[PDB]
Design a protein around this ligand. Structure first.
Ligand code: HEM
Ligand code: HEM
Ligand SMILES: Cc1cc(N)nc(C[C@@H]2CNC[C@@H]2OCCNCC(F)(F)c2cccc(Cl)c2)c1
Ligand SMILES: Cc1cc(N)nc(C[C@@H]2CNC[C@@H]2OCCNCC(F)(F)c2cccc(Cl)c2)c1
Ligand SMILES: C[C@H](O)[C@H](O)[C@H]1CNc2nc(N)[nH]c(=O)c2N1
Ligand SMILES: C[C@H](O)[C@H](O)[C@H]1CNc2nc(N)[nH]c(=O)c2N1
Ligand SMILES: [Zn+2]
Lengths: 410, 412
C-alpha cells in the first residue's frame, strides 16, 4: 500500500504515497501486466460533481486555503451550476492550474521538470474554425519565439453534449505529408499517408514532395472540419547536416523545430477539453532515432550506412548502431547551429531524475512509465534505465483519443 | 477470454489465450503498474497436491497421454507419496520437461527460441559441497565445449524443510572479484565486492587483480558453504580487442565466455530446487553495454572516449553513445575471432520475435517482459521495441531468491 522505488545505480530508495490518490485503471491486473501496450455518452450530473469536488479540493489545497470560506463558496457555486446547467465553467486560475497539473501528471513525459513554466492560452471564447486557426498561428509564433522555444498550450471550448466537439484533426500541428507512389514505395512520411489522403479529398493541393508541411484540419462546434495552411513563415524548419560528414547535408533532410501534440484530450475537474494543442521542444532522439530510423518512418539507416562505407554484410558489425549515432549527432548539431532549442537524451533524463526526486520530496511521488521514459537509444547509459518507476493515473490528465475521422459523420 | 498484442512496425496483431493458465501474481493492480520494479518455510501437503497435479496434467498432455492409465497411476502414486512423506520425487522425464518449461516460461529471456535444446544434468543424488563442486566442474566443461557453447542446467536436491537447502552462493558460476580500496575506488568488478569479502573471510587468497575469477562457495544440505577454485583450464576467457582500433587491447580488457546463472530457484510441480545453475551463451550487449559501461560496473566509457579523441566537453556530442558502440563492436569481434559463441542484439531480437510468433500459434501465447527483452542500447532499431508484450507468470518457473548470506543459519 505504501510503495518503494529503488535506483539500482545509486541505491537511493524513495517512498511513494501519491499513488493512493490514483483513480483511473491501468490495464494491468494481478495476473497480467500490460505495461508495454500503447492503448491498454458525456458525464451525467451524478458523475460530474465528485470529479469537480476532487479537483477543487486539490486546487484550494495548493493555494493553502483548504476548507476556507472561499473554498466552501466555490464548491457551493459549482454544485449550483451543475444541477442547473448540467456542466460548469472553470475560473482562469483553475484552468491554468489544471493544465499545468495535467502535464505534471503525464507519466510518459521525460520533460516534466518544466511543468510549472507553461503558458496557457485560454481559447474558450473561440466559436469557428477560422477562430481556431488564428489561435493556433498565435500559439505557433509564441512557442517558436524565433528558435528560443517556449512551452505553451491553447485550450478550446469544453465538450458539451459531445455532438459539438472542438477537435484538431492533425495529430501534431506541424507534420510532413505522406503519399503512396506508383513505384509502390512511399514518398514523405509514411505515418501520415491516411491523413494526407483525407486532406486531398477535402481539397488540399498537395505539392507532392518529401517534406510538405500538412494543412491544419480544424473542427469547431461539432461541424465538418475545414482546411488552413499555417503561414510558411511561422513554421521554423532545420536543414540537417553533420559536423564531420560533408556528404550528410546531401541526403536532403530537414525537420521542424516545434513539436506540438494536438490530438489529446485534457480532463480537468471532470470537464473534457477535446482540442488542447500543446508544445515544448524536442529531445533529439525523437527525430534522429524514431522519425529518421524507424522502418515504418523515413527509414534512412541503409542510405547513411552506405555513405559511411560500413560493413553492411553482417548485423554483428553493428553498422545500424554506428549510423544511428551519427544521424543523432547530426540532428543535435543542426538544431544547435541554427539556435533552435533541443535537448539531448543524456541531459533530459538527468533532469528527469532530479525532477522525480523533487516530486517524491515535495508531493510523495511521480507517476512514470519506464517503457516511454527510457530513450529509444543508449538506454542503460542514461540514468532513467536504472530507476524503478511506478505508473499510475492521476487527474487532471492528458488522454489519447481516437482519430476523429473514425467518429465524425459529415 | 482473448487478449490482443500489436506490432507497431508491422501491424501484425496476435491473440493470447495462454494467460488464462497464469496463477502467480505480477505485482500490478488495476491502480498501479510495477512493470519496471526489479523485485515486485516449507509448503503444506494441501497446497502441494494441486501443484503436483497441475504439473503432471501439463506433462501428460505434452506427451499426448492425458487421461491414460499411466497418467492416472502417476497421479495416484504422487498423491500417496505426498500424504505419506509430505513431498514427492520427480521422474527423470518430468524433471527434464520441467527444466525446459521453466526456461520456456522465463518472460525476461530473449534467448528462448533455444528452450527445447537444453542439456539437463540430474544432480539429485548429490550430498556434499565437494559433490556439488564436481557436478559444477562437469557442467562448465560440457557447456563450454571449447568455445562451441551448449545450453545446460544442473539440478541439485530439492528443498525439504527449508533447513537443509542446497545453494550456490555465487550469483553466476564464473565472475570476477571486486575489491574496495581505502581511497574509495574499486579494483575489478564493483558488483561483486560483498561476495568477494565473504570469500576472503571464508579463507580465499585473493590475487587482488582486475579480472580474478571468483571461487565457488557451495552449500550442501543446509550446511555452512565451502570454497572451491574452478580449475583455471576450465574457465574460457576472451581478451578484448577492436577490429580497427589497435589501442583497444591495451585497455587490458577480457571477459569469460560462459554466462551461468547460479542464484535462482527452479519450481516444478510445487517442488523447489534452490540450487539449479544454468548456462547458455552471451548476447554481446550484456558485456559491452552493462558489464563494461554501467557507471556501477567497469565504467570504461570515459577511458574509451578519451582514446578515441571524442569531444567530451558536452553530452550532446553523443561521445558516450559513440564509445558505447565501439566497445560493443570489440566484444562481438573478439568472441567471433576466438570462435566463442555469442549473439548480437539484432540477431537475438529478430530470433525472439520469430519464436514469439511461433509460440502464439502453437501455444496460444508467450509471456514477455518488455523492460528486459529490449536491449540496453539501440532499443528502437530492434524489432522487439515495437512489439507489444504480455507479461504473466507460468510454472514451471525460475524465481529470484534472496542471497543466502542474509538468511543462512551458521553452524560454525
Ligand atoms: C519542454 C519540453 C518537453 C520535452 C523535452 C518533452 C519530452 C517528451 C518526450 C520525449 C515524450 C515521449 C513522446 C514520444 O516518444 O512520442 C513526451 C511525451 C508526452 N509529454 Fe512531453 N515534453 C516536453 C513538453 C511537454 C508539454 C509542454 C506537455 C503538456 C502541456 C507535455 C506532455 C506530454 C504528454 C501528454 C506525453 C505523452 C504523449 C502521447 O501519449 O503521445 N510535454 N514528452
Ligand atoms: C542460450 C542462450 C541465451 C541467451 C542469448 C539468453 C539471453 C538472455 C538475456 C540477455 C537475459 C537478460 C539477462 C540480464 O540482463 O541479466 C536473459 C534472462 C534470463 N534467462 Fe536467458 N538466455 C539464454 C539462455 C538461457 C537458459 C539456458 C536459461 C535457463 C535454462 C535462461 C533463463 C533465463 C532467466 C531465468 C532469465 C531472467 C534472469 C534474471 O531474472 O536474473 N536463459 N536471457
Ligand atoms: C497509439 C498512440 C498512443 C499515444 N498515447 N500516442 C501516440 C503518438 C506517438 C507516440 N510516439 C510517437 C508518436 O508521437 C507523436 C508526438 N510526439 C511527441 C512530440 F514530438 F510531439 C513532442 C516532443 C517533445 C515535446 C512535445 Cl510537447 C512533443 C500514439
Ligand atoms: C535484483 C535482481 C533480480 C533479478 N531477477 N535478477 C538480477 C540479476 C541481474 C539481471 N541483470 C544483471 C544481473 O544479471 C547478471 C547475470 N546476467 C545474465 C547472464 F549473463 F548470466 C546470462 C546471459 C545469457 C544467458 C545466460 Cl543463461 C545467462 C538481479
Ligand atoms: C510496444 C511499445 O510499447 C511501443 O513500441 C512504445 C515503446 N516505447 C516508446 N517510448 C516513447 N517515448 N515513444 C513511443 O512511441 C514508444 N513506443
Ligand atoms: C529499474 C529497471 O527495472 C532495471 O534497471 C532493469 C531494466 N531492464 C533490464 N533488462 C535486462 N535485460 N537486465 C536488467 O538488469 C535490467 N534492469
Ligand atoms: Zn503492469
Amino acid at each position: 500500500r505504501f510503495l518503494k522505488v529503488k535506483n539500482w545505480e545509486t541505491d537511493v530508495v524513495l517512498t511513494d504515497t501519491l499513488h493512493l490518490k490514483s483513480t483511473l485503471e491501468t490495464g494491468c491486473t494481478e495476473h497480467i501486466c500490460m505495461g508495454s501496450i500503447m492503448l491498454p455518452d458525456v458525464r451525467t450530473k451524478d458523475q460530474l460533481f465528485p470529479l469537480a469536488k476532487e479537483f477543487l479540493d486539490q486546487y484550494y489545497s495548493s493555494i493553502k486555503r483548504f476548507g476556507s470560506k472561499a473554498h466552501m463558496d466555490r464548491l457551493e457555486e459549482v454544485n449550483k451550476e451543475i444541477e442547473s446547467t448540467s456542466t460548469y465553467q472553470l475560473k482562469d486560475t483553475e484552468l491554468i492550474y489544471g493544465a499545468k497539473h495535467a502535464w505534471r501528471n503525464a507519466s510518459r513525459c521525460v520533460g516534466r521538470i518544466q511543468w510549472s513554466k507553461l503558458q496557457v492560452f485560454d481559447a474558450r471564447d473561440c466559436t469557428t474554425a477560422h477562430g481556431m486557426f488564428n489561435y493556433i498561428c498565435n500559439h505557433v509564433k509564441y512557442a517558436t519565439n524565433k528558435g528560443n522555444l517556449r512551452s505553451a498550450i491553447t485550450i478550446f471550448p469544453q465538450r458539451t453534449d459531445g455532438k459539438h466537439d472542438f477537435r484538431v484533426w492533425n495529430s501534431q500541428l506541424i507534420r510532413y505529408a505522406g503519399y503512396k507512389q506508383p513505384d509502390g514505395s512511399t514518398l514523405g512520411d509514411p505515418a501520415n499517408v491516411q491523413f494526407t489522403e483525407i486532406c486531398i479529398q477535402q481539397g488540399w493541393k498537395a505539392p507532392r514532395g518529401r517534406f510538405d508541411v500538412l494543412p491544419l484540419l480544424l473542427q469547431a462546434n461539432g461541424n465538418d472540419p475545414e482546411l488552413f495552411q499555417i503561414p510558411p513563415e511561422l513554421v521554423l524548419e532545420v536543414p540537417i547536416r553533420h559536423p564531420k560528414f560533408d556528404w550528410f547535408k546531401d541526403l536532403g533532410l530537414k525537420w521542424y523545430g516545434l513539436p506540438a501534440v494536438s490530438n489529446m484530450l485534457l480532463e480537468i475537474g471532470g470537464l473534457e477539453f477535446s482540442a488542447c494543442p500543446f508544445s515544448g521542444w524536442y529531445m533529439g532522439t525523437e527525430i534522429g532515432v524514431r522519425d529518421y530510423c524507424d522502418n515504418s518512418r523515413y527509414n534512412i539507416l541503409e542510405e547513411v550506412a552506405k555513405k559511411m562505407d560500413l560493413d553492411m554484410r553482417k548485423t554483428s558489425s553493428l553498422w545500424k548502431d554506428q549510423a544511428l549515432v551519427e544521424i543523432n549527432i547530426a540532428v543535435l548539431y543542426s538544431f544547435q547551429s541554427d539556435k533552435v532549442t533541443i535537448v539531448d537524451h543524456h541531459s533530459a533524463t538527468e533532469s528527469f531524475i532530479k525532477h522525480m526526486e523533487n516530486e517524491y520530496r515535495c508531493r510523495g511521488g511521480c507517476p512514470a512509465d519506464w517503457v516511454w521514459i527510457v530513450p529509444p537509444m543508449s538506454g542503460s547509459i542514461t540514468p532513467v534505465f536504472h530507476q524503478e518507476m511506478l505508473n499510475y493515473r492521476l487527474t487532471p490528465s492528458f488522454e489519447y483519443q481516437p482519430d476523429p475521422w473514425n467518429t465524425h459523420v459529415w
